Design a protein around this ligand. Structure first.
Ligand SMILES: [O][B]1([O])O[C]C2=[C][C]=C([N]C(=O)[N]C3=[C][C]=[C][C]=[C]3)[C]=C21
Ligand SMILES: [Zn+2]
Length: 256
C-alpha cells in the first residue's frame, strides 16, 4: 500500500486517494509575508492538565502516543476554533537529515521534524465521525529544530527501543504533553487535511510560530525506527513527511 518510498510515496497517493489533488490539501508552505494578521483571532486554550496517555505504537509510518479521549481530559479550544476538541494522539514526521523532515514549511524553510497533536470535535461523538467532517479535527503543529535537548521529549525517546518495528506497542502512561509546547502560543491557521491517506479534508490547522529544540541525539533515535515489521527487511523510518501542497484558494491567518 501507500508509503514514503519511491514507488508508493506522496506522488503516488492520488491513484488510490484522488482527494490528494483536492482544494484544501496539506501540508503547505507558510509565506509569512502573505499570511494575514487577524485581530479577531482568539487566544488558543490548551488544557492538558488532565491528559491521560495510554501507550505508544509504531504503525508502520510513524509512532503514535495515544490518550484516553473518552472524556474531556485534555482539550483544545479558542483560537479559530468553535467548540471543544479532545486530544486523541500525537506523532511526528522527520527526515534523514536535519535540513528536512517538517511537513509545513516557513518561507520554504524545512525543519528537522514536525509534531502533530491531534484533536477531534466532540460534537461529532467519535474520531471516526469527526474525520468525515470539514471541521472535525484540530491539529496543533509544532516544528522541531536541532539544538539543545528537550527534556519533555526524552521519555518518548527512551521507549522507542521497545517499538522498533511496525505493529509493536508499549504502555506509555503518565506522559505530560505540556512538556512538548514552546513558550509562546502564537500561531498561523488555515483549513487543510490529513497529511497521510485517506488525506481527508477535515483539519483546521494551527501551526505554532515558535519551534521547540531537540538534540541531535534525540532525533537520531527517531531515525533508528523501522517502517517494516519484525522479521522483514529493515527499512529505516526516515523522511515520513509529505511535500508542501498548492495553497489554491486559501489564505493563512496569523494570530500575531
Ligand atoms: O495529518 B496527520 O498526519 O496529523 C494528524 C492526523 C490524524 C489522523 C491521521 N490519519 C487518519 O485519521 N487516518 C484514517 C484512517 C482510516 C480512516 C480514517 C482516517 C493523519 C494525521
Ligand atoms: Zn501528522
Amino acid at each position: 500500500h501507500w508509503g514514503y518510498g519511491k514507488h508508493n510515496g506522496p506522488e503516488h497517493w492520488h491513484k488510490d486517494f484522488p482527494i490528494a489533488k483536492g482544494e484544501r490539501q496539506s501540508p503547505v508552505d507558510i509565506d509569512t509575508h502573505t499570511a494575514k494578521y487577524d485581530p479577531s483571532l482568539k487566544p488558543l486554550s490548551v488544557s492538558y492538565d488532565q491528559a491521560t496517555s495510554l501507550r505508544i505504537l509504531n504503525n508502520g509510518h510513524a509512532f503514535n502516543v495515544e490518550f484516553d479521549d473518552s472524556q474531556d481530559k485534555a482539550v483544545l479550544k479558542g483560537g479559530p476554533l468553535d467548540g471543544t476538541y479532545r486530544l486523541i494522539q500525537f506523532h511526528f514526521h522527520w527526515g534523514s537529515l536535519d535540513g528536512q523532515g517538517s511537513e509545513h514549511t516557513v518561507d520554504k524553510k524545512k525543519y528537522a521534524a514536525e509534531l502533530h497533536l491531534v484533536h477531534w470535535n466532540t460534537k461529532y461523538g467519535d474520531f471516526g465521525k469527526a474525520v468525515q467532517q470539514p471541521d472535525g479535527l484540530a491539529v496543533l503543529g509544532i516544528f522541531l529544530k536541532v539544538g539543545s535537548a528537550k527534556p519533555g521529549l526524552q521519555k518518548v525517546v527512551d521507549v522507542l527501543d521497545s517499538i522498533k518495528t511496525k505493529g509493536k506497542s508499549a504502555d506509555f502512561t503518565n506522559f505530560d504533553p505540556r512538556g512538548l509546547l514552546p513558550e509562546s502560543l502564537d500561531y498561523w491557521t488555515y483549513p487543510g487535511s490529513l497529511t497521510t491517506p485517506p488525506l481527508l479534508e477535515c483539519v483546521t490547522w494551527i501551526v505554532l510560530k515558535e519551534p521547540i529544540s531537540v538534540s541531535s541525539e534525540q532525533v537520531l533515535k527517531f531515525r533508528k525506527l523501522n517502517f517494516n515489521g519484525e522479521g522483514e527487511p529493515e527499512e529505516l523510518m526516515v523522511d515520513n513527511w509529505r511535500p508542501a501542497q498548492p495553497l489554491k484558494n486559501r489564505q493563512i491567518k496569523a494570530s500575531f
